[PDB]
């Protein structure tokens, strides 16, 4: 698709994360699915990731970002899930209370994306050269 | 694709890196080239992640890896390319010489890959429940 880079590097790392709050399913709704939505889409730019989709469901949340390449994986899924817990928590202090805490389990998945031409590689190399 | 699991994680992440060397008069072939796929394979396994297609002409570099959550791409291209450019030199003096400690260029290319399908996307949240 579309490259970013800087001098440092022509880099395109797109992630599919997802993952499920802790106690089933009378959480993600409503205010609280709005909020979940903003913050999460503001995470992405604070780091300087980019939401490509993010689908929020009362069962699961799935987050499609693009991002720069300092990032590890791992960093991304708690660092997301991380601090979202945090803002939402003290956004809607009813849940904090009735999670005990715990608004997510302490699980991800994490999936890369992207199916790379041999035309761009070629690309990179005489525009490199250059 | 396939998707492995830690205690805490499941994942996919496939990345293809592409580099190359700042000289060109036939400076990675043959006696080099076999190396240099060599060294790849084995700093690949040193890191846990696992080659899916290595290739090596005199113009570039195609490691082609899937890798743990836990390593950031930056933290994988400066670690393959480091990591051999230091061992290469050592049993290829003749190049050490003909070189002065540059055996690449000090870019890089990452490029994620792998599909999610929905189906993929519920069989995660399903088996998270129990």
């Known amino acids: 698709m579309e490259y970013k880079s800087t ?11 997802v993952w499920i709050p802790k106690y089933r399913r009378k959480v993600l709704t409503g205010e609280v699915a709005e909020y979940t939505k903003e913050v999460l889409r503001t995470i992405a730019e604070e780091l300087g990731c ?10 699961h949340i799935h ?3 693009n991002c ?12 997301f899930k991380g601090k979202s817990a945090r803002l939402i928590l003290k956004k809607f202090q009813e849940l904090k209370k009735s999670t005990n805490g715990k608004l997510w389990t302490r699980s991800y998945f994490v999936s890369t ?12 190399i005489e525009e490199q050269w250059a």
């Open 68 to 79: 720069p390449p300092r990032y590890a994986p791992s960093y991304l899924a708690n660092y």
């Open 113 to 124: 994306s992207g199916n790379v031409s041999s035309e761009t590689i070629k690309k990179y």
């Open 63 to 65: 987050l499609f970002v």
């Open 7 to 17: 001098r440092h590097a022509k880099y395109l790392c797109n992630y599919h994360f």
């Open 50 to 59: 980019e939401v490509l989709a993010l689908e929020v469901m009362p069962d």
